[PDB]
Amino acid sequence: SLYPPPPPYVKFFTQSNLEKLPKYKEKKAASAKEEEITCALDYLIPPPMPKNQQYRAFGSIWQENESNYQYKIQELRKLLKSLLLNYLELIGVLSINPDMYERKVENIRTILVNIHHLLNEYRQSRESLIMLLEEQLEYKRGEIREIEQVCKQVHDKLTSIQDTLRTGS
Amino acid sequence: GQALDAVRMRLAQLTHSLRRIRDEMSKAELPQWYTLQSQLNVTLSQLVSVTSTLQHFQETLDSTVVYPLPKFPTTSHESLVTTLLRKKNIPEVDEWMKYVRETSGEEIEKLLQQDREITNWARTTFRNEYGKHDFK
Amino acid sequence: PLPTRFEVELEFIQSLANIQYVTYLLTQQQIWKSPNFKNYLKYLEYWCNPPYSQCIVYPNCLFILKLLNGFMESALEGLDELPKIIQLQGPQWMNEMVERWAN
């Protein structure tokens, strides 16, 4: 069907199984002193994390104070200059002998592809943390400073009123 | 189109009667019993007329073929189109007749003719019983 | 190879986010009638803490199951209103998820 069937073990665990789970896990721990499914109550025991700390799904694999970059910068600049130079040479190829133009085209793309690699090491979450950091920091400083400004102006008004009433005495 | 027009007007008046009985039941105070009986009987006999007239003109309704308008936009009104398109019964009625058939559960044909003869015999017996005593 | 129970339970949890899946599951009588399914739903609650929460793909179901948790004391009735209510309350629920995680 369109919707896959519920998992099979879901139907094994009734309320009686839930209430008898404590004694079952106590007995299992006492006896113990891929997990084989010898009893229907085994699944409620929390599954163990794989030792390799890896998870595979759909053909793809998955697994501290914030809780020479100049070399990369100059590499990027020289790569951009070389990319412009190669673009000029490739368009010249198109001009004179376009029949073999593709011979350079993908080459240029490789440099562009390398640029993407040069982005990968530069990857930005810390920079986003920084920018959010300063925006809420400056917002709270603005709120604070307007608080002492308003309380100070109220106090100044109170002192002026006190002087006015003392003069009228 | 004439048959569907008559179906339209009769079903419209039936829906009007339903709206009526609705807005006189929605009141916090229940009216007299007799008014409720009158409304019930009128609306229910009207439903009978609806059923009979829908029975009469099945051929005209069947002959008609449903097709969306060229001017009607389905991109924006696909939800509205699907709302009227769907026809599956409400589930509770479904398991209702499922349990009904479960409870009910050449042999069947001869039971059928035995039911025929019981029906005819009972009809004749009650005709005789009515004729036995003068009711006028 | 045969996937482990981790993979199937995680995929079930992430598929619970679909409104169509929830509507289909609640359409059948015996799914809600059987206490086994709700027992499994309450068992699934323990994935809201790390490091399990680091393995999720769509955080919305995190509330949905919790919303489904509410369904055991709110009633089936309300199944029809489920798509409308999720569409209407998507903004504030996304905001509260962001507050729970992004802050």
Binding site: - | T15, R19, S79, T82, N89, I90 | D80
Partner: peptide, 25 residues
């Protein structure tokens, strides 16, 4: 003329009961 038109009694909240099953290829 027409004494009164009918009030709109649309029920979009109705969930419908369309059976879906031939999705797998």
């Amino acid at each position: 003329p027409s004494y009164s038109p009918t009030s709109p009694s649309y029920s979009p909240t109705s969930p419908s009961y369309s059976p879906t099953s031939p999705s797998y290829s």
